[PDB]
Ligand binder design. Structure first.
Ligand SMILES: CCn1c2ccc(CNC)cc2c2ccc(-c3cscn3)cc21
Ligand SMILES: [Zn+2]
Length: 196
C-alpha cells in the first residue's frame, strides 16, 4: 500500500547526484542538499545523476515513482490534477495522468500498477557516455505542488529504484520535490527557515 523509501545502496553502490544550479530568480531547477529537496518549475528539465561503484548487469532498469510525504496522505496515489490530466500535452508516450515523465528516452515505459494503481516511469540503465563519470536521466514534473484537486500543496517524494530485469530491488534513493513558479526563491526561503 505504501512503497518503501529506505535508502539502500545495494551491491552496486547505487545513489543519486544533483547539479549545483544556484538560487537565482531565473533558475528552473535547483537541488537543496540540506533539505534533500529538488525545486523545479512546471514541465522543465530536471537532471538527476545516477552513480554506481560497479557495473550492473545488462537489463538493469531505473524506475521513478512519486508518493506523498505526509503520513496521513501516503496511501493516496500521486497523480496529475483534474486540469492537467486533460490539457492534451502528451508526448506520445506518457499517459496524461502521470506526474513524472522521462524526457528524450524512447525506451521509457510507463506503468500503471494493476494492484496499487500507482504510476511509475522506468528506463534501461545505461553506462555513462564516453568522457563522463555518471549517467543522467532528465525528468519532468507535470503539475504544480499547489494544483487544486491534485497535489493541493501537499509535499511529495520521488523514489528512484535500481531494479533487475524482473523488477527486483537492487538499490534505492529518494528526494523531496516542490514544483513551483520560483524554485530559486523558494529554495532560499526553505533553507533560511531550516537554519532559523
Ligand atoms: C547507473 C548508471 N551507470 C553508471 C554510473 C556511474 C558509473 C561510475 N563512473 C565512474 C558507472 C556506471 C555504469 C556502468 C554500467 C552501466 C550499465 C551497463 S548495462 C546497464 N547498465 C550503468 C552505469
Ligand atoms: Zn496540475
Amino acid at each position: 500500500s505504501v512503497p518503501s523509501q529506505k535508502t539502500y545502496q545495494g551491491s552496486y553502490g547505487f545513489r543519486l547526484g544533483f547539479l549545483h544550479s544556484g538560487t537565482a530568480k531565473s533558475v528552473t531547477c535547483t537541488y537543496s542538499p540540506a533539505l534533500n529537496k529538488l525545486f523545479c518549475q512546471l514541465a522543465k528539465t530536471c537532471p538527476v545523476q545516477l552513480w554506481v561503484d560497479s557495473t550492473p548487469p545488462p537489463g538493469t532498469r531505473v524506475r521513478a515513482m512519486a508518493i506523498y510525504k505526509q503520513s496521513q496522505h501516503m496511501t493516496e496515489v500521486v497523480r496529475r490534477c483534474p486540469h492537467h490530466e486533460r490539457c492534451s500535452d502528451s508526448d506520445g508516450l506518457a499517459p496524461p495522468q502521470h506526474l513524472i515523465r522521462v524526457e528524450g528516452n524512447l525506451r521509457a515505459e510507463y506503468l500503471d500498477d494493476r494492484n496499487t494503481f500507482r504510476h511509475s516511469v522506468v528506463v534501461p540503465s545505461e553506462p555513462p557516455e564516453v568522457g563522463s563519470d555518471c549517467t543522467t536521466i532528465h525528468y519532468n514534473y507535470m503539475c504544480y505542488s499547489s494544483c487544486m484537486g491534485g497535489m493541493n500543496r501537499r509535499p511529495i517524494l520521488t523514489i528512484i529504484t535500481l531494479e533487475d530485469s524482473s523488477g527486483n530491488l537492487l538499490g534505492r534513493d529518494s528526494f523531496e520535490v516542490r514544483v513551483c513558479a520560483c524554485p530559486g526563491r523558494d529554495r532560499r526561503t526553505e533553507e533560511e527557515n531550516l537554519r532559523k
